[PDB]
Design a protein around this nucleic acid. Structure first.
Lengths: 260, 167, 152, 141
RNA sequence: GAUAAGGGAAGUCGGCAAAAUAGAUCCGUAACUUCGGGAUAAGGAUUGGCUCUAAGGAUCGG
RNA sequence: CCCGUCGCUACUACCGAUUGAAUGGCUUAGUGAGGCCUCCGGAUUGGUUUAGGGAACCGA
RNA sequence: UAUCUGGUUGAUCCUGCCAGUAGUCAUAUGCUUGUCUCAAAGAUUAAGCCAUGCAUGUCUAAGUAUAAGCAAUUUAUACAGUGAAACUGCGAAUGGCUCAUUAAAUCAGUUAUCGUUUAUUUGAUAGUAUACUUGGAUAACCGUGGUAAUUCUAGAGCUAAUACAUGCUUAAAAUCCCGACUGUUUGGAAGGGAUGUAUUUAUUAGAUAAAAAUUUGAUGAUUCAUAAUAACUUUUCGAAUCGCAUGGCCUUGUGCUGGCGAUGGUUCAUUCAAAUUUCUGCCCUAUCAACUUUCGAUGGUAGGAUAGUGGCCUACCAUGGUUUCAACGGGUAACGGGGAAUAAGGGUUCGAUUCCGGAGAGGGAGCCUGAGAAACGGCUACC
């Protein structure tokens, strides 16, 4: 209506932010940025609702205005900066490094990593095409554009970005047997290996993925993120639970035994 | 009280749609246009006041008009404006030629002078050097990243040459 | 304001569509330029998104390309002689796309030497969009068809 | 029936036949395959008709939905209407009712269709007030 | 035999007498009806001059 | 037990001269504000700027 | 809780309705009202009319400071701290309200953009063949004012920019065109021009079924990306900007160099969006059966216009398009949906209203600015 919207009602916010109904009328509308609105996590939500370092928005604004928060190696002072999948957030003042990886329950896990692992990230290649002066380039899932890629790189591959120079360390070809995380649908957060890829020209390609518990599920190719060269060898540390989906009865048994 | 607008060749008042840049109007917001009644540019008997500028001084002094004078409120501020104002060369130092008006605050008086614009300073030259050095450094980083890619392509193509030879 | 929306029209079955909403800016229209031949006069128009269009009110010369030799020269145009849309444009010398014009032959003659004084052309540019009357030179069967139509 | 039946010369855009060429005086013809496993009819590769809206010889592209129906009208020039019959489920009565929808489609001169045939149409960009589909394959009925 | 400011039948038994309309093309056309009409109903638009454009044919030649 | 004219009272709707009346929507025709585009126009106002009195000629 | 009971008869069994009974995120109203938590509330009738006040403004070390503002003499006699007023930038198109219109319209699920525009955010991306750094306006300000009246402004005197209008600074090659002379078996050449990026044409790459007589990307699909050639252009922009630190080399110079940042800028990608768009699905009405096509209705060709597709409009040409499987018309005490009430199941009724989509700001219409409005706490005009 006459231009872009700038507000987000609390009830209309993404459910994986885990915002409460009665805390207010509105929710933080994520800014434009590397990640899509529905698949991101604003830094105000990450720093206040998840870590609970800040108790409210005045404190998250004071924190970010003191230059503490860095995302992917660059200082951000935008309280609504749209942090997203695979981004590295470093707070060296508290000496903490986090990686935003989905857990098998569909939410962004609070997954702490070492600074050495916080020195890089993975990006899924969305497209390869020619830029100006006939220079090929690759677009990753977080909107990055890397020039002069390896001529072997094609779409749906995953590259490992050095994240300090922005260059490509190495890559993983999309093929059968690669480790994959699902980045969409009801299988969000699950990790498994490709068993067989079923193609549908003019439609959506479907990927068959087998869980570590030999559970097989089907999902769209757009929801598939390659994270490792083979089973049990991910290129990033997985969150607690290792992406193995348990039935509700099994979860109930595990919680009962854990709590007594 | 309606003012006269240049170009309206009438002795009476008319209503015009005035916009930005027009006299007799001040737009409240950008792109705003107002229909206002304005007086024509032809003098008649219906004027309440007429504004006149003396072109050539007459015979007799006017009591409060031609004997005294009021100095201009501000002196030149831009460096080149100072240079035009009183014979400076591009090599002269404008810094010790600004006219300073001194204010008297009770007992102690100090002078206030404008900040000169378009003045070339070591910081300005440092910024010019930084911009051109950065442009050259960027150009070399791009042309050696391109050279490195040319090495990568040449390596791959030679490897595919031997791959075809094997196959 | 002139608009392009299909709301004002009736449905395929013939039903008279009711009044849904007021006219929107994001579907407007503007008047035809009606390019003539005369001292080069162009007006720039502020379009949607900050782009700019150039009405060719009247023009004198535009660049024309000889397809057989791959040569493009800027040369004068005499007038439009054939227009598949409307013959009033031919009569009044209105320069639009797909209109057959006559061009000065001096630059093509001089290039031919270095390597009836008026050559036929078809304007491929859109003067009411860009402000240039750029076209190519008729050759072959296209030429034969247009000459048959002109002579009759 | 001639290709050059209009007040303007009919030709494929930007397809240039050089008069100053060799003796093989054959007019250069452009064509494409539309994809989705649809075969290009040879009347397009070898024909002479000009149709900017043809899937094979024109500049339109096939993308979106692929529909089938029975031709019920060929009385328009290069445009047909196919009739799509379907069953609508009425949950209260646990039964169905016959319904139909009429879709107007463009037919290229590469195909010959009569009333009663079953054709397959693919979705294209709006090429008329009511036409958004374009014939890709014809099955005689 | 003409014309007439403003009003417009107040004149007169009575709109008597005069006025107004008027050709052609195009649009639109009510009640009622014996279905044939009413109908030129009512009510509107256009019309000059000049310079052009298009359509409509005949006889010969396979 | 029961039907109906007729007479009285009350209420409801129908037909009905009045070319009845009022309100709202759509529309033919006539008149037509205003904005926008175009065509010239050129109050005044700077000099491509040149001139021993200054004559110009360029733009907005 | 998948329930029934009273009323026609002298008495009976039925059909059948009237009446009873309970709930209502269902409203009003009467009587009555002690406590805790939670919480609707000028929708219904009048999208009827509005006094008054407020609801949209905004500065960081980092655009422009001679306030004749405050403060102190201090690393500072160009300014330097703080800081009104103004110019500049951005926002004001979000939010909030309401439900009049609206019945394939909105909307829902599902699709498309190889059919387009996109401020901003985030990545990349530009050496292109007077320089110690260009101009002249203007505000605030001073002082002359006119009107009863308004967020009215006019003369006169100043002065600034990331405002306005202009402009150089630079690698190394290499390539192309014209081409005096020259070699003279077809070569060499002096001298002239051109190279980045945008615009608009025309023409070429852009390949890819397996043996005998050197390159070439993506797609399901393209005339795609991109490159090249010949030209074109009231010639786009390739930083005349701003803060903090002040470092390094000595051939003792205001010498040459340079660190972190502000803002800006072309194109591509991304994101926030927008606009069209495929399929299927809307309540009552036949005392609505034919409707659309003068003056666009359906389609074809060409054009114009648009950000773009498209009868969106124009010219020419065909006679098409929908309909008893209900078109078209009329009504709605009709915004659509997520949902709500009651309910054994199936259903019936409701949804103005906390969220999504749409539309509107008394009724229409027309527009400026801007990336974005046919905006109304913007303007112009009529009623």
């Amino acid at each position: 209506a006459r231009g872009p919207k700038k507000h987000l009602k609390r009830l209309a916010a993404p459910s994986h932010w885990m915002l409460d109904k009665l805390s207010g009328t509105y929710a933080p509308r994520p800014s434009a940025g590397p990640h899509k609105l529905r698949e991101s996590l604003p830094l105000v939500v990450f720093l206040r609702n998840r870590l609970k370092y800040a108790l409210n928005g005045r404190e998250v604004k004071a924190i970010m205005m003191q230059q503490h928060v860095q995302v992917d190696g660059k200082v951000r002072t935008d309280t609504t900066y749209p942090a997203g999948f695979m981004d590295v957030i470093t707070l060296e003042a508290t000496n903490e490094h986090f990686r935003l990886v989905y857990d098998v329950k569909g939410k962004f896990a609070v997954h702490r990593i070492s600074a050495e692992e916080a020195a890089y990230k993975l990006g899924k290649v969305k497209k390869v095409q020619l830029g100006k002066k006939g220079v090929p380039y690759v677009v990753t899932h977080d909107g990055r554009t890397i020039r002069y890629p390896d001529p072997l790189i094609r779409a749906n591959d995953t590259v490992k970005i050095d994240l300090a120079t922005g260059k490509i360390d190495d890559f993983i070809k999309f093929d059968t047997g690669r480790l994959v995380m699902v980045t969409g649908g009801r299988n969000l957060g699950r990790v498994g290996v490709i068993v067989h890829r079923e193609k549908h020209e003019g439609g959506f390609d479907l990927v068959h993925i087998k869980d570590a518990l030999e559970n097989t599920f089907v999902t769209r190719l757009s929801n598939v993120f390659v994270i490792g060269t083979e089973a049990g060898k991910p290129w990033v540390s997985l969150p607690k639970g290792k992406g193995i989906k348990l039935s509700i009865s099994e979860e109930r048994d595990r919680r009962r035994a854990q709590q007594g | 009280g309606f003012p006269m607008k240049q170009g309206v060749m009438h002795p009476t008042r008319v209503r015009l749609l005035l916009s930005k840049g027009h006299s007799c109007y001040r737009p409240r917001r950008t792109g705003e246009r107002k229909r206002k009644s304005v007086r024509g540019c032809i003098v008649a008997q219906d004027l309440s006041v007429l504004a006149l500028s003396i072109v050539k001084q007459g015979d007799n002094e006017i009591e409060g008009l031609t004997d005294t004078t009021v100095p201009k409120r501000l002196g030149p501020k831009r460096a080149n404006h100072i240079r035009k104002f009183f014979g400076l060369t591009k090599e002269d130092d404008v810094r010790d030629f600004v006219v300073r008006r001194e204010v008297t605050k009770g007992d102690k008086t100090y002078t206030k002078a404008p900040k000169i614009q378009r003045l070339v300073t070591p910081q300005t030259l440092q910024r010019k050097r930084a911009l051109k050095a950065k442009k050259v450094k960027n150009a070399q980083q791009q042309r050696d990243a391109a050279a490195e890619y040319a090495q990568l392509l040449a390596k791959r193509l030679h490897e595919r040459k031997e791959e075809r030879a094997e196959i | 304001g002139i608009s392009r929306d299909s709301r004002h029209k009736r449905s395929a079955t013939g039903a008279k569509r009711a009044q849904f909403r007021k006219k929107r800016k994001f579907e407007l229209g503007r008047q035809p330029a009606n390019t003539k031949i005369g001292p080069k006069r162009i007006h720039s128009v502020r379009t949607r998104g900050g782009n700019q269009k150039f009405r060719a009110l009247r023009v004198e010369t535009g660049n024309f390309s000889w397809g057989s030799e791959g040569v493009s020269r800027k040369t004068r145009i005499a007038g439009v002689v054939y227009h598949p849309s409307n013959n009033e444009l031919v009569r009044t010398n209105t320069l639009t796309k797909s209109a057959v014009v006559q061009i000065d032959a001096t630059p093509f003659r001089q290039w031919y030497e270095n390597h009836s004084g008026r050559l036929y052309a078809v304007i491929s540019s859109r003067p009411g969009q860009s402000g240039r009357c750029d076209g190519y030179i008729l050759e072959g069967e296209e030429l034969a068809f247009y000459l048959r139509r002109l002579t009759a | 029936l001639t290709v050059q039946s209009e007040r303007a010369f009919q030709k494929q855009p930007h397809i240039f036949t050089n008069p100053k060429a060799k003796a093989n005086k054959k007019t250069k013809r452009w064509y494409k395959d539309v994809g989705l496993g649809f075969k290009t009819p040879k009347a397009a590769i070898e024909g002479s008709y000009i149709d900017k809206k043809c899937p094979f010889a024109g500049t339109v592209s096939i993308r979106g939905k692929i529909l089938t129906g029975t031709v019920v009208s060929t009385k328009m020039h290069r445009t047909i209407i196919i009739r799509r019959d379907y069953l609508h489920y009425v949950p209260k009565y646990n039964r169905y009712e016959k319904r139909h929808k009429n879709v107007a489609a463009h037919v290229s001169p590469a195909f010959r269709v009569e009333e009663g045939d079953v054709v397959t149409v693919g979705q294209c960009r709006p090429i008329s007030k009511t036409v958004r589909f374009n014939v890709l394959k014809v099955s005689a009925g």
